[PDB]
Design an enzyme around this catalytic site. Sequence first.
Site, short mmCIF file in Angstrom:
data_model
loop_
_atom_site.label_atom_id
_atom_site.label_comp_id
_atom_site.label_asym_id
_atom_site.label_seq_id
_atom_site.Cartn_x
_atom_site.Cartn_y
_atom_site.Cartn_z
N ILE A 13 0.83 -1.23 0.00
CA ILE A 13 0.00 0.00 0.00
C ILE A 13 0.85 1.25 0.00
CG2 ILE A 13 -2.03 -1.10 1.02
CD1 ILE A 13 -1.38 -0.04 3.77
N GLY A 16 8.67 3.53 -0.73
CA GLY A 16 9.55 4.69 -0.72
C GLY A 16 11.01 4.31 -0.72
N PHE A 18 12.79 4.90 1.82
CA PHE A 18 12.72 4.28 3.18
C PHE A 18 12.08 2.89 3.18
N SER A 20 8.65 -0.12 2.67
CA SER A 20 7.39 -0.44 2.11
C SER A 20 6.40 -0.53 3.26
CB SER A 20 7.45 -1.76 1.38
OG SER A 20 8.11 -1.48 0.20
N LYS A 36 4.88 -1.13 8.40
CA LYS A 36 5.94 -0.56 7.62
C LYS A 36 7.23 -1.32 7.94
CE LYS A 36 8.13 3.85 6.71
NZ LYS A 36 7.90 5.33 6.84
N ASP A 134 5.67 17.30 10.55
CA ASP A 134 5.48 16.92 9.14
C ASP A 134 3.99 16.71 8.79
OD1 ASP A 134 6.60 16.48 6.54
OD2 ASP A 134 6.68 14.31 6.95
N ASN A 139 0.19 12.29 5.29
CA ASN A 139 0.40 11.81 6.68
C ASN A 139 -0.92 11.85 7.46
OD1 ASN A 139 3.09 11.49 6.09
ND2 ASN A 139 3.80 13.37 6.96
N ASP A 151 2.38 8.88 10.52
CA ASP A 151 3.81 9.19 10.17
C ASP A 151 4.51 10.09 11.17
OD1 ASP A 151 6.30 9.37 8.95
OD2 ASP A 151 5.48 9.34 6.94
N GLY A 153 7.45 10.07 11.97
CA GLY A 153 8.90 10.17 11.67
C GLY A 153 9.65 11.48 11.89
C1 LIG Z 1 0.92 4.11 2.72
N1 LIG Z 1 -0.11 3.86 3.76
C2 LIG Z 1 -1.35 3.52 3.47
C3 LIG Z 1 -1.99 3.31 2.23
C4 LIG Z 1 -3.35 2.96 2.25
C5 LIG Z 1 -3.96 2.69 0.87
O1 LIG Z 1 -3.53 3.19 -0.15
N2 LIG Z 1 -4.72 1.61 0.84
C6 LIG Z 1 -5.12 1.06 -0.50
C7 LIG Z 1 -6.61 1.07 -0.78
N3 LIG Z 1 -7.05 2.42 -1.24
C8 LIG Z 1 -8.34 2.23 -1.94
C9 LIG Z 1 -9.08 3.54 -1.75
C10 LIG Z 1 -8.91 3.60 -0.25
C11 LIG Z 1 -7.37 3.34 -0.13
C12 LIG Z 1 -4.07 2.78 3.44
O2 LIG Z 1 -5.42 2.45 3.45
C13 LIG Z 1 -3.41 3.01 4.65
C14 LIG Z 1 -2.05 3.35 4.68
C15 LIG Z 1 -1.16 3.59 5.73
C16 LIG Z 1 -1.22 3.57 7.16
C17 LIG Z 1 -0.06 3.87 7.90
C18 LIG Z 1 1.16 4.18 7.27
C19 LIG Z 1 2.37 4.47 7.99
C20 LIG Z 1 3.03 5.69 7.82
C21 LIG Z 1 4.24 5.90 8.51
C22 LIG Z 1 4.82 4.97 9.38
C23 LIG Z 1 4.20 3.72 9.52
C24 LIG Z 1 2.99 3.48 8.83
CL1 LIG Z 1 2.39 1.88 9.08
C25 LIG Z 1 1.19 4.20 5.89
C26 LIG Z 1 0.07 3.86 5.10
C27 LIG Z 1 -0.45 3.82 9.25
O3 LIG Z 1 0.29 4.05 10.20
N4 LIG Z 1 -1.71 3.47 9.39
C28 LIG Z 1 -2.21 3.35 8.14
O4 LIG Z 1 -3.35 2.95 7.92
#
Ligand SMILES: Cn1c2cc(C(=O)NCCN3CCCC3)c(O)cc2c2c3c(c(-c4ccccc4Cl)cc21)C(=O)NC3=O
Length: 258
Positions: A13, A16, A18, A20, A36, A134, A139, A151, A153
């Site tokens: 999902i 970067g 950094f 995935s 992550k 940030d 985020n 995020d 970070g």
């Molecule tokens: C890149 N990313 C995401 C991406 C998506 C996303 O694109 N899902 C795919 C489905 N699409 C379809 C239309 C709705 C979203 C998501 O639903 C949640 C997160 C998402 C989350 C997170 C993070 C994240 C950022 C920084 C550090 C650690 C994490 Cl896990 C990063 C994340 C998070 O903490 N909680 C989250 O739900």
Amino acid sequence: SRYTTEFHELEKIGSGEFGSVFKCVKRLDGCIYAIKRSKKPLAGSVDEQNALREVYAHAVLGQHSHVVRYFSAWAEDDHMLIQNEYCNGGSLADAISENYRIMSYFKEAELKDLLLQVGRGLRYIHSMSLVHMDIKPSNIFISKVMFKIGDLGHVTRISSPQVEEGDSRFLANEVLQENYTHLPKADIFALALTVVCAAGAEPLPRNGDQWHEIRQGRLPRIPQVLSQEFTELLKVMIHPDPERRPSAMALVKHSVLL
Ligand SMILES: Cn1c2cc(C(=O)NCCN3CCCC3)c(O)cc2c2c3c(c(-c4ccccc4Cl)cc21)C(=O)NC3=O
Ligand SMILES: [Cl-]
């Protein structure tokens, strides 16, 4: 590996330099988490310090409905992992991109709701003597829609003498100048601009004359009509004097947001 044994990876999902990020089912509890997986930085490095601050921030910021909940973090291979609450509406950045293509943006009531919910998350972060550093639509996560700050970070203590700057589209000028007297108000500035993006604005500038003009307190052009009262709020939140910006608490109590 713990990752492989405890979790079924369903979907990548995010990507970067950094990490995935994967959407995963935890086998034992049946729930979906966002995980992550980043490369373990070198022991003792300034980079490990940064990595671990995200973890320490998450582990003191687990009580709030407008901050993504943390479950666990661990190390294994040359990888660092963090397992967080899954937000199934994706990021605010993607909801903004979709809206941009269809020319249908957040309406004023939805913008106020966005402002207020993230306002509540910042008031919480800020009462822990921390600053996010940030705030930007990529985020903010969406899960009644819920918006949650994620995020962590760039998170730092509020009176830190050294700061890692967040995204320059959202960066207050005082932080760029290395003046950290009023760091909470940097989050307030980034939030206004996040709300400006949600309102339909063109992509924000990274540098150049348009960058400097916003930092003079001029709101970017928004392609819809908002109440004067609401525009004035957004404009004061980007005031070049950080003390003029409302604190997160004054924001949540604001009459525009009642
Ligand atoms: C890149 N990313 C995401 C991406 C998506 C996303 O694109 N899902 C795919 C489905 N699409 C379809 C239309 C709705 C979203 C998501 O639903 C949640 C997160 C998402 C989350 C997170 C993070 C994240 C950022 C920084 C550090 C650690 C994490 Cl896990 C990063 C994340 C998070 O903490 N909680 C989250 O739900
Ligand atoms: Cl963004």
